[PDB]
Ligand binder design. Sequence first.
Ligand code: 44N
Length: 265
Amino acid sequence: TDRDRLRPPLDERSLRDQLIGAGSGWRQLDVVAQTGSTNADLLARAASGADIDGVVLIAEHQTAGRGRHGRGWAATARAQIILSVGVRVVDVPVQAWGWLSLAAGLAVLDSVAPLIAVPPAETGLKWPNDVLARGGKLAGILAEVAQPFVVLGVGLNVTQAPEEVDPDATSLLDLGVAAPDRNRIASRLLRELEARIIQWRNANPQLAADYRARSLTIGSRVRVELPGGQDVVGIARDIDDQGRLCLDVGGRTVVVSAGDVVHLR
Ligand SMILES: C[C@@]1(O)[C@H](O)[C@@H](COS(=O)(=O)NC(=O)CCCC[C@@H]2SC[C@@H]3NC(=O)N[C@@H]32)O[C@H]1n1cnc2c(N)ncnc21
């Protein structure tokens, strides 16, 4: 396609020079041509005894991508920023681990928001980990546990065409960003991610405050698809200290730890 000409390879050396060294918490960065799932790969390293804290794995292409709740993640080569990072979480209370996921989505959103000329409606964060722009899914986040670590996975559509992955998908290119530089975006993303992880680790109140400011879900009428198939309709009001969605259901409070959110009119 013509989008191929808009997809130059990542510069691994440059990313390492920018993100590994004094002032940065990242300890290792690798760009692989192809893998099944970057999340699976880092989990596998951890399972074999590796210290994956601050370790970054980026894949140009991902052939067996994983979504939440056993779903899939589709990609074509060089069309996305596909990465996983390792985070040591054992030093943080387990009840707060849910916010690490929310922090990641916030980091992704902040890294790409200024690239758009004018931000269209419905641009922000859908609970739990959807980056939305113009109602389309720009990025998906997946957090998986492997003691003492959490592996955070980001799939960000840069030039990815919606017809290649999902009808509800969008990308930076489809938002009007003519020539997105994945090297620059990856660098900005990982710098934002480091900051949010540090905030999360120290229970910084600004994390929750910043999340609320970008939330498309809070204040909206929603249908929440719960694990198991049940649907609950209400109005989203807040996120609690565990990262759970608090719903107003006819005056009753329903707190959801996991589910798929659909924003209603
Ligand atoms: C087909 C779909 O409807 C999927 O069922 C669904 C998955 O949504 S989900 O359950 O909320 N899960 C997520 O969004 C988390 C995805 C995390 C992927 C990252 S990439 C590197 C890392 N390693 C790994 O295997 N997973 C993580 O989004 C759609 N989708 C499928 N690819 C899509 C696309 N590129 N754009 C938009 N929508 C898509």
